[PDB]
Amino acid sequence: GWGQGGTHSQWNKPSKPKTNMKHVAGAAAAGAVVGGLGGYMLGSAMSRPLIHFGNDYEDRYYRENMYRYPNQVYYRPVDQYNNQNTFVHDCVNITVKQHTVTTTTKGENFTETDIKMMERVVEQMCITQYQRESQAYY
Amino acid sequence: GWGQGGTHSQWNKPSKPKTNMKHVAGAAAAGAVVGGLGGYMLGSAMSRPLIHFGNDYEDRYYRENMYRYPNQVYYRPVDQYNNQNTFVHDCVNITVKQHTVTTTTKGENFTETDIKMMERVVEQMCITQYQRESQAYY
Amino acid sequence: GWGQGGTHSQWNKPSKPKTNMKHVAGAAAAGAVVGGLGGYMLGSAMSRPLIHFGNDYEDRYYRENMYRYPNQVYYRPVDQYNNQNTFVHDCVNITVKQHTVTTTTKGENFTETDIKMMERVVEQMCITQYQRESQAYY
Amino acid sequence: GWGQGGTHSQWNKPSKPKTNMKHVAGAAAAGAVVGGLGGYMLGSAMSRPLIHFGNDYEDRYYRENMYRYPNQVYYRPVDQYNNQNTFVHDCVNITVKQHTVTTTTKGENFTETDIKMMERVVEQMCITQYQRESQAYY
Amino acid sequence: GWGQGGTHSQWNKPSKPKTNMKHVAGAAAAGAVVGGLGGYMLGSAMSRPLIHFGNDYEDRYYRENMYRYPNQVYYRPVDQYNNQNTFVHDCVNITVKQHTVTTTTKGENFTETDIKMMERVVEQMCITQYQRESQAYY
Ligand SMILES: *[C@@H]1O[C@H](CO)[C@@H](O)[C@H](O)[C@H]1NC(C)=O
Ligand SMILES: *[C@@H]1O[C@H](CO)[C@@H](O)[C@H](O)[C@H]1NC(C)=O
Ligand SMILES: *[C@@H]1O[C@H](CO)[C@@H](O)[C@H](O)[C@H]1NC(C)=O
Ligand SMILES: *[C@@H]1O[C@H](CO)[C@@H](O)[C@H](O)[C@H]1NC(C)=O
Ligand SMILES: *[C@@H]1O[C@H](CO)[C@@H](O)[C@H](O)[C@H]1NC(C)=O
Ligand SMILES: *[C@@H]1O[C@H](CO)[C@@H](O)[C@H](O)[C@H]1NC(C)=O
Ligand SMILES: *[C@@H]1O[C@H](CO)[C@@H](O)[C@H](O)[C@H]1NC(C)=O
Ligand SMILES: *[C@@H]1O[C@H](CO)[C@@H](O)[C@H](O)[C@H]1NC(C)=O
Ligand SMILES: *[C@@H]1O[C@H](CO)[C@@H](O)[C@H](O)[C@H]1NC(C)=O
Ligand SMILES: *[C@@H]1O[C@H](CO)[C@@H](O)[C@H](O)[C@H]1NC(C)=O
């Protein structure tokens, strides 16, 4: 007539996490867990992987049992070329340019005029602005 | 008639984490856990991996049992070429340029004019601004 | 009729962590745990990895049991070429340039004019500003 | 009828950590733990790794048991070339330049004018400013 | 009918750590623990690694048990070339330059003018400023 108390356990219990950031790449933030017996595991081999939050009871009576390589993980990869990549390209290859090429041969009595006005061409770009009861003036 | 008290345990219990940052790359922040028996594990091999928050009871009676290599991890990778990468490119390859190429051969009595006005061309770019009851004037 | 008191234990218990930072790369900050039996483990091999927050009871009676290499970790990698990398490129390759190339051959009585006005071209860039009841004037 | 008192233990218990910093690279800060039996462990091999916050009870009666290499870690890596790196590039390769190349051959009676005005071209860049009831004037 | 008092122990218990710093590289600061049986351990091999905050009870009766190399760590790495590095590049390769190249051959009666105005070109850069009820005037 024994007794085990109930378990109220948290692998991650953050209370009121107020966080301001920009980039979360390959990481964990704002009270987040990257995988329980998992996550970013490109090549894995797990024998008898068990997750049970409930109570566990075992009454085992093993007699003259021949266990030959139980839960064996024969991890023998050959020439494994696997790609599991995350690519994020934001505001990449942005060009604001004015280019002029001049190639004049034996030019006599000639006038060359190259005017490239560039005014108010881009006012805003990639403005990741979060507003809450706020004001922004540009 | 024994008794084990209940377990109220937290691997990470941050209370009210107020944090300001910019980049979280390959790390942990703001009360976050990178993996419980996991995370970023490209090549792994785990035999009998068990996670159970509940109470555990075991009553084992093993007699004359032949256990030959139980829970064996034969980790023998050969020529493993695996890629699990996180790429973040933000505001990369940004160019604001004015380029002029002049190639004049035996130019007689000629006038060359190259005017490239560049005014108010980019006012804002990559402005990651978080506003809460605030004001910004540009 | 024995008794074990309940366990209220925290691997990390930070209370009210107020933190200001910029970059968290490959590290831990703001009360964060990088992995419990895990994290950033590119090549790993764990036999019988067990995590249980609950109470543990074991009543083992092993008699004449032949355990040949139990929980054996045969970690024999050959030519393992694995990449699990985090890449963050923010405001990289930013160029604000005015370039002029002049190549004149036997130029007689000629006028060369190269004007590149550059005014108010970029007012703000990569402004990671967090505002709370604040004001910014540019 | 014995008794063990409950354990209330913290591997890291920082109370009200108020911290201001810039870079946390490959380190620990703001009351953070880098791994419990883990963290940044590129090549690892652990046999029977166990974490249990709850109470542990063991009643073992082993008789005539042949344990041949139990929990053996055969850590024999050959030619292991693994990369688990964190790369953070912020405001890298920033160039503000005015370049002029002049190549004149036998130039007679010629005027060369190279004007590159550069005014108010970049007002702010990489301004990582955290504001709380504050004012900034540029 | 014995009794063991409860353990309230902290590996690190900093109360109200108020800290101001700039760089935390490969270190520990602000009441942070770099790893419990872990941290930054690129090549490791641990047999039976156990962490349990709860109370431990062991009643072992071992008789005529043959333990051949129990918990053996055969740590024999060969040609291990592993890289787990943290790279942080902030405000690197910043160039503000005005360059002029002059190559004139047998130039007769010619005027060369090279004007590169550079005014208010960069007002702020890499300003990591934390403000709390404060004022900054530029
Ligand atoms: C455009 O961007 C891609 C990646 O998004 C890059 O690989 C390439 O070199 C760029 N091309 C240009 C700038 O012409
Ligand atoms: C061009 O050059 C020739 C030189 O032989 C001259 O006769 C002519 O007047 C020139 N053109 C002008 C518009 O002056
Ligand atoms: C453009 O960016 C890519 C990566 O995003 C870089 O590899 C490449 O060299 C860049 N090309 C340019 C600047 O022309
Ligand atoms: C160009 O040069 C020739 C020199 O022979 C001259 O006759 C002519 O007047 C010139 N052109 C002008 C517009 O002066
Ligand atoms: C552009 O950036 C990439 C990385 O983002 C770098 O490898 C390359 O050399 C750069 N190219 C330029 C500056 O032309
Ligand atoms: C150009 O040079 C020649 C020299 O022979 C001269 O005759 C001519 O007047 C020149 N051009 C001008 C516009 O002066
Ligand atoms: C651009 O930056 C990369 C790394 O981000 C560096 O390796 C390269 O040499 C740089 N290229 C330039 C400055 O042209
Ligand atoms: C150019 O030089 C020649 C010298 O022979 C001269 O005749 C001519 O007047 C010059 N050009 C000017 C505009 O003075
Ligand atoms: C640019 O920076 C990289 C590292 O970020 C450095 O290795 C390289 O020499 C630099 N290139 C330049 C200054 O051209
Ligand atoms: C250029 O030099 C020659 C010398 O022979 C001269 O005749 C000519 O007047 C010169 N040019 C000017 C504009 O003085």
Short mmCIF file of N, CA, C and O in Angstrom, two decimals, chain D residues 48-137:
data_model
loop_
_atom_site.label_atom_id
_atom_site.label_comp_id
_atom_site.label_asym_id
_atom_site.label_seq_id
_atom_site.Cartn_x
_atom_site.Cartn_y
_atom_site.Cartn_z
N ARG D 48 24.28 4.88 -21.04
CA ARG D 48 23.34 5.01 -19.93
C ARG D 48 23.36 6.40 -19.28
O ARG D 48 23.66 6.53 -18.09
N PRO D 49 23.07 7.46 -20.05
CA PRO D 49 22.98 8.80 -19.44
C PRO D 49 21.59 9.02 -18.86
O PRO D 49 20.59 8.98 -19.58
N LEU D 50 21.52 9.26 -17.55
CA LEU D 50 20.25 9.32 -16.84
C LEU D 50 20.14 10.64 -16.09
O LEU D 50 21.06 11.03 -15.37
N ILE D 51 19.00 11.31 -16.26
CA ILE D 51 18.65 12.51 -15.50
C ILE D 51 17.25 12.32 -14.94
O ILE D 51 16.29 12.18 -15.71
N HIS D 52 17.12 12.31 -13.61
CA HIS D 52 15.81 12.20 -12.99
C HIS D 52 15.76 13.08 -11.74
O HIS D 52 16.43 12.80 -10.75
N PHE D 53 14.94 14.13 -11.79
CA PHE D 53 14.80 15.02 -10.65
C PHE D 53 14.08 14.35 -9.48
O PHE D 53 14.27 14.78 -8.33
N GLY D 54 13.29 13.32 -9.74
CA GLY D 54 12.56 12.66 -8.68
C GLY D 54 13.45 11.81 -7.80
O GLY D 54 14.63 11.57 -8.08
N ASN D 55 12.87 11.36 -6.69
CA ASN D 55 13.59 10.51 -5.76
C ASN D 55 13.91 9.15 -6.39
O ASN D 55 13.15 8.63 -7.20
N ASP D 56 15.05 8.60 -6.00
CA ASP D 56 15.54 7.33 -6.53
C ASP D 56 15.61 6.30 -5.41
O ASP D 56 16.17 6.58 -4.35
N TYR D 57 15.05 5.12 -5.66
CA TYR D 57 15.13 4.00 -4.74
C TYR D 57 15.61 2.77 -5.50
O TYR D 57 15.08 2.46 -6.57
N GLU D 58 16.61 2.09 -4.95
CA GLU D 58 17.17 0.90 -5.58
C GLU D 58 17.34 -0.19 -4.53
O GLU D 58 17.99 0.03 -3.50
N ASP D 59 16.77 -1.36 -4.81
CA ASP D 59 16.91 -2.55 -3.96
C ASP D 59 17.42 -3.67 -4.86
O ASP D 59 16.63 -4.43 -5.43
N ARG D 60 18.74 -3.77 -5.00
CA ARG D 60 19.37 -4.68 -5.94
C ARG D 60 19.88 -5.91 -5.20
O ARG D 60 20.52 -5.80 -4.16
N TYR D 61 19.59 -7.09 -5.76
CA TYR D 61 20.10 -8.37 -5.27
C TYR D 61 20.66 -9.11 -6.48
O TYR D 61 19.93 -9.83 -7.17
N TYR D 62 21.95 -8.91 -6.74
CA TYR D 62 22.62 -9.52 -7.87
C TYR D 62 23.42 -10.73 -7.38
O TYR D 62 24.24 -10.60 -6.47
N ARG D 63 23.16 -11.89 -7.98
CA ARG D 63 23.82 -13.13 -7.58
C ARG D 63 24.28 -13.88 -8.82
O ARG D 63 23.46 -14.21 -9.68
N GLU D 64 25.59 -14.14 -8.91
CA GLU D 64 26.18 -14.94 -9.98
C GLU D 64 25.85 -14.38 -11.36
O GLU D 64 25.61 -15.12 -12.31
N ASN D 65 25.86 -13.05 -11.47
CA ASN D 65 25.59 -12.37 -12.73
C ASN D 65 26.90 -12.01 -13.42
O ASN D 65 27.78 -11.41 -12.80
N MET D 66 27.02 -12.38 -14.69
CA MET D 66 28.22 -12.13 -15.48
C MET D 66 27.98 -10.90 -16.33
O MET D 66 27.28 -10.95 -17.35
N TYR D 67 28.57 -9.77 -15.92
CA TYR D 67 28.46 -8.51 -16.66
C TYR D 67 29.75 -8.32 -17.44
O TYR D 67 30.79 -7.97 -16.88
N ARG D 68 29.68 -8.54 -18.75
CA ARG D 68 30.84 -8.41 -19.64
C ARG D 68 30.73 -7.07 -20.36
O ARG D 68 29.88 -6.90 -21.24
N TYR D 69 31.60 -6.13 -19.99
CA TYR D 69 31.64 -4.80 -20.57
C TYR D 69 30.28 -4.08 -20.54
O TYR D 69 29.76 -3.70 -21.59
N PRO D 70 29.69 -3.88 -19.36
CA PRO D 70 28.44 -3.12 -19.30
C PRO D 70 28.70 -1.62 -19.38
O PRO D 70 29.67 -1.10 -18.81
N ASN D 71 27.81 -0.93 -20.09
CA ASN D 71 27.91 0.51 -20.31
C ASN D 71 29.26 0.88 -20.93
O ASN D 71 29.88 1.88 -20.56
N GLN D 72 29.71 0.07 -21.88
CA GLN D 72 31.00 0.30 -22.52
C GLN D 72 30.86 1.36 -23.61
O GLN D 72 29.93 1.32 -24.42
N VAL D 73 31.79 2.31 -23.62
CA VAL D 73 31.81 3.38 -24.62
C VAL D 73 33.03 3.14 -25.51
O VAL D 73 34.15 3.53 -25.17
N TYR D 74 32.81 2.48 -26.65
CA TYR D 74 33.88 2.24 -27.62
C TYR D 74 33.96 3.45 -28.55
O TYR D 74 33.42 3.46 -29.66
N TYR D 75 34.65 4.48 -28.08
CA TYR D 75 34.76 5.75 -28.80
C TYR D 75 36.01 5.67 -29.68
O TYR D 75 37.12 5.98 -29.25
N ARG D 76 35.82 5.26 -30.93
CA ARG D 76 36.91 5.09 -31.89
C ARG D 76 36.56 5.78 -33.21
O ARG D 76 36.29 5.11 -34.22
N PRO D 77 36.54 7.11 -33.24
CA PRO D 77 36.31 7.80 -34.51
C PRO D 77 37.56 7.82 -35.38
O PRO D 77 38.68 7.96 -34.88
N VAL D 78 37.35 7.67 -36.68
CA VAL D 78 38.43 7.71 -37.67
C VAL D 78 38.06 8.71 -38.75
O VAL D 78 36.98 8.63 -39.34
N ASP D 79 38.96 9.66 -39.01
CA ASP D 79 38.80 10.65 -40.07
C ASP D 79 37.48 11.41 -39.93
O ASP D 79 36.73 11.59 -40.89
N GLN D 80 37.20 11.86 -38.71
CA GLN D 80 35.97 12.60 -38.43
C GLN D 80 36.19 14.07 -38.79
O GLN D 80 36.97 14.76 -38.13
N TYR D 81 35.51 14.54 -39.83
CA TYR D 81 35.60 15.92 -40.28
C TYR D 81 34.20 16.53 -40.21
O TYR D 81 33.48 16.59 -41.21
N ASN D 82 33.83 17.02 -39.03
CA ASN D 82 32.50 17.57 -38.80
C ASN D 82 32.60 19.04 -38.44
O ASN D 82 33.55 19.47 -37.77
N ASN D 83 31.62 19.82 -38.89
CA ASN D 83 31.59 21.26 -38.67
C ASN D 83 30.22 21.65 -38.14
O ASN D 83 29.21 21.47 -38.82
N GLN D 84 30.19 22.18 -36.91
CA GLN D 84 28.99 22.75 -36.31
C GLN D 84 29.36 24.14 -35.80
O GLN D 84 29.70 24.31 -34.63
N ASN D 85 29.29 25.13 -36.68
CA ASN D 85 29.77 26.47 -36.40
C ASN D 85 28.63 27.48 -36.51
O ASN D 85 27.72 27.33 -37.33
N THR D 86 28.70 28.51 -35.68
CA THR D 86 27.75 29.62 -35.70
C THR D 86 28.45 30.84 -36.28
O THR D 86 29.46 31.30 -35.75
N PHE D 87 27.90 31.37 -37.38
CA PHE D 87 28.46 32.53 -38.06
C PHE D 87 27.46 33.68 -38.00
O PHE D 87 26.32 33.54 -38.44
N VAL D 88 27.90 34.81 -37.45
CA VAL D 88 27.09 36.03 -37.37
C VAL D 88 27.88 37.16 -38.02
O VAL D 88 28.95 37.53 -37.53
N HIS D 89 27.35 37.69 -39.12
CA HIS D 89 27.96 38.80 -39.84
C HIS D 89 26.98 39.97 -39.83
O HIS D 89 25.98 39.95 -40.54
N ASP D 90 27.28 40.98 -39.02
CA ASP D 90 26.44 42.16 -38.85
C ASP D 90 27.22 43.40 -39.28
O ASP D 90 28.29 43.68 -38.73
N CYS D 91 26.68 44.13 -40.26
CA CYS D 91 27.29 45.38 -40.73
C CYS D 91 28.72 45.14 -41.20
O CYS D 91 29.63 45.92 -40.90
N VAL D 92 28.91 44.07 -41.95
CA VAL D 92 30.20 43.66 -42.49
C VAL D 92 30.27 44.12 -43.94
O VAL D 92 29.25 44.24 -44.63
N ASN D 93 31.49 44.39 -44.41
CA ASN D 93 31.75 44.84 -45.79
C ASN D 93 30.98 46.12 -46.11
O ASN D 93 30.42 46.26 -47.20
N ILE D 94 30.95 47.05 -45.17
CA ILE D 94 30.32 48.35 -45.39
C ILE D 94 31.36 49.31 -45.96
O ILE D 94 32.40 49.55 -45.33
N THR D 95 31.09 49.86 -47.14
CA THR D 95 32.04 50.71 -47.83
C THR D 95 31.35 52.00 -48.24
O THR D 95 30.29 51.97 -48.88
N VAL D 96 31.94 53.13 -47.87
CA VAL D 96 31.51 54.44 -48.36
C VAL D 96 32.73 55.07 -49.01
O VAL D 96 33.60 55.63 -48.33
N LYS D 97 32.81 54.99 -50.34
CA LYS D 97 34.04 55.34 -51.03
C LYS D 97 33.73 56.20 -52.25
O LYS D 97 32.65 56.11 -52.83
N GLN D 98 34.69 57.04 -52.62
CA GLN D 98 34.67 57.78 -53.87
C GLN D 98 36.00 57.53 -54.56
O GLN D 98 37.04 58.00 -54.09
N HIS D 99 35.98 56.79 -55.66
CA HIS D 99 37.19 56.36 -56.35
C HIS D 99 37.22 56.93 -57.76
O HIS D 99 36.20 56.92 -58.46
N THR D 100 38.39 57.42 -58.17
CA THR D 100 38.59 57.98 -59.50
C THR D 100 39.84 57.38 -60.11
O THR D 100 40.89 57.33 -59.46
N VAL D 101 39.74 56.93 -61.36
CA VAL D 101 40.86 56.40 -62.11
C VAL D 101 41.08 57.29 -63.33
O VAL D 101 40.16 57.50 -64.12
N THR D 102 42.30 57.81 -63.47
CA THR D 102 42.66 58.69 -64.58
C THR D 102 43.79 58.05 -65.38
O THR D 102 44.84 57.70 -64.82
N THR D 103 43.57 57.90 -66.69
CA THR D 103 44.57 57.34 -67.61
C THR D 103 44.51 58.17 -68.89
O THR D 103 43.74 57.86 -69.80
N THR D 104 45.34 59.21 -68.96
CA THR D 104 45.38 60.11 -70.10
C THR D 104 46.72 59.97 -70.82
O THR D 104 47.78 60.04 -70.19
N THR D 105 46.66 59.77 -72.14
CA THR D 105 47.84 59.63 -72.99
C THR D 105 47.93 60.78 -73.97
O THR D 105 46.98 61.03 -74.72
N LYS D 106 49.07 61.49 -73.96
CA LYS D 106 49.36 62.64 -74.84
C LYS D 106 48.17 63.58 -74.97
O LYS D 106 47.77 63.98 -76.07
N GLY D 107 47.60 63.96 -73.83
CA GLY D 107 46.53 64.93 -73.79
C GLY D 107 46.97 66.38 -73.90
O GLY D 107 47.67 66.89 -73.02
N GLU D 108 46.56 67.05 -74.98
CA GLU D 108 46.99 68.40 -75.31
C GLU D 108 45.81 69.35 -75.17
O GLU D 108 44.74 69.09 -75.73
N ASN D 109 46.01 70.44 -74.43
CA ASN D 109 45.01 71.51 -74.29
C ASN D 109 43.68 70.99 -73.76
O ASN D 109 42.62 71.42 -74.22
N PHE D 110 43.70 70.08 -72.80
CA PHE D 110 42.45 69.55 -72.29
C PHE D 110 42.29 69.83 -70.81
O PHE D 110 43.26 69.88 -70.05
N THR D 111 41.03 70.01 -70.40
CA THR D 111 40.66 70.28 -69.02
C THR D 111 39.95 69.06 -68.45
O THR D 111 39.01 68.54 -69.07
N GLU D 112 40.39 68.61 -67.28
CA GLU D 112 39.78 67.47 -66.62
C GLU D 112 39.12 67.96 -65.34
O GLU D 112 39.77 68.60 -64.51
N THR D 113 37.83 67.65 -65.19
CA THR D 113 37.08 68.04 -64.00
C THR D 113 36.43 66.80 -63.40
O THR D 113 35.67 66.11 -64.08
N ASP D 114 36.73 66.54 -62.14
CA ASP D 114 36.21 65.38 -61.41
C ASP D 114 35.68 65.90 -60.08
O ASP D 114 36.45 66.08 -59.13
N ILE D 115 34.38 66.12 -60.01
CA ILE D 115 33.72 66.60 -58.80
C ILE D 115 32.80 65.51 -58.30
O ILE D 115 31.94 65.02 -59.04
N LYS D 116 32.98 65.11 -57.04
CA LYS D 116 32.16 64.10 -56.39
C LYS D 116 31.70 64.68 -55.06
O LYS D 116 32.37 64.52 -54.04
N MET D 117 30.56 65.36 -55.08
CA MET D 117 29.99 65.88 -53.85
C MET D 117 29.45 64.73 -53.02
O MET D 117 28.82 63.81 -53.54
N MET D 118 29.71 64.78 -51.71
CA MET D 118 29.29 63.73 -50.79
C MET D 118 28.84 64.43 -49.51
O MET D 118 29.66 64.71 -48.62
N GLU D 119 27.55 64.73 -49.42
CA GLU D 119 26.98 65.48 -48.31
C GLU D 119 25.77 64.74 -47.76
O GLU D 119 24.88 64.35 -48.53
N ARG D 120 25.74 64.55 -46.44
CA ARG D 120 24.60 63.93 -45.75
C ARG D 120 24.26 62.58 -46.37
O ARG D 120 23.09 62.20 -46.48
N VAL D 121 25.30 61.84 -46.76
CA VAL D 121 25.10 60.62 -47.55
C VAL D 121 24.57 59.49 -46.68
O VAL D 121 23.66 58.76 -47.08
N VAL D 122 25.16 59.29 -45.50
CA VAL D 122 24.65 58.34 -44.52
C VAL D 122 24.52 59.07 -43.19
O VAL D 122 25.51 59.54 -42.63
N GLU D 123 23.29 59.16 -42.67
CA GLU D 123 23.11 59.83 -41.39
C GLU D 123 23.21 58.86 -40.22
O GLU D 123 23.83 59.18 -39.20
N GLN D 124 22.62 57.67 -40.34
CA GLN D 124 22.73 56.66 -39.30
C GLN D 124 22.91 55.29 -39.94
O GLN D 124 22.42 55.04 -41.05
N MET D 125 23.60 54.41 -39.23
CA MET D 125 23.83 53.05 -39.71
C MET D 125 24.17 52.17 -38.52
O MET D 125 24.98 52.56 -37.67
N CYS D 126 23.57 50.98 -38.47
CA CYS D 126 23.81 50.00 -37.41
C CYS D 126 23.57 50.60 -36.03
O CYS D 126 24.33 50.35 -35.09
N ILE D 127 22.51 51.39 -35.90
CA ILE D 127 22.17 52.03 -34.62
C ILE D 127 21.29 51.05 -33.85
O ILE D 127 20.07 51.00 -34.03
N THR D 128 21.92 50.25 -32.99
CA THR D 128 21.20 49.32 -32.12
C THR D 128 20.89 50.06 -30.83
O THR D 128 21.64 49.99 -29.85
N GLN D 129 19.78 50.78 -30.82
CA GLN D 129 19.40 51.63 -29.70
C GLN D 129 18.13 51.10 -29.05
O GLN D 129 17.11 50.90 -29.73
N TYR D 130 18.18 50.87 -27.74
CA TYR D 130 17.02 50.46 -26.96
C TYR D 130 16.56 51.66 -26.14
O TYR D 130 17.34 52.21 -25.35
N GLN D 131 15.30 52.05 -26.31
CA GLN D 131 14.76 53.25 -25.70
C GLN D 131 13.59 52.89 -24.79
O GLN D 131 12.71 52.11 -25.17
N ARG D 132 13.60 53.45 -23.58
CA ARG D 132 12.50 53.28 -22.63
C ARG D 132 12.27 54.63 -21.95
O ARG D 132 13.05 55.04 -21.09
N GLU D 133 11.20 55.33 -22.36
CA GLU D 133 10.88 56.66 -21.85
C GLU D 133 12.04 57.62 -22.03
O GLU D 133 12.31 58.48 -21.19
N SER D 134 12.74 57.49 -23.16
CA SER D 134 13.95 58.25 -23.44
C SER D 134 13.79 59.04 -24.73
O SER D 134 12.80 58.90 -25.46
N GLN D 135 14.78 59.89 -25.01
CA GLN D 135 14.77 60.73 -26.20
C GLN D 135 16.14 60.69 -26.86
O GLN D 135 17.17 60.72 -26.18
N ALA D 136 16.14 60.63 -28.19
CA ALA D 136 17.37 60.68 -28.98
C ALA D 136 17.20 61.70 -30.09
O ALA D 136 16.21 61.66 -30.83
N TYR D 137 18.16 62.61 -30.21
CA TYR D 137 18.12 63.68 -31.20
C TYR D 137 19.34 63.57 -32.10
O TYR D 137 20.47 63.59 -31.61
#
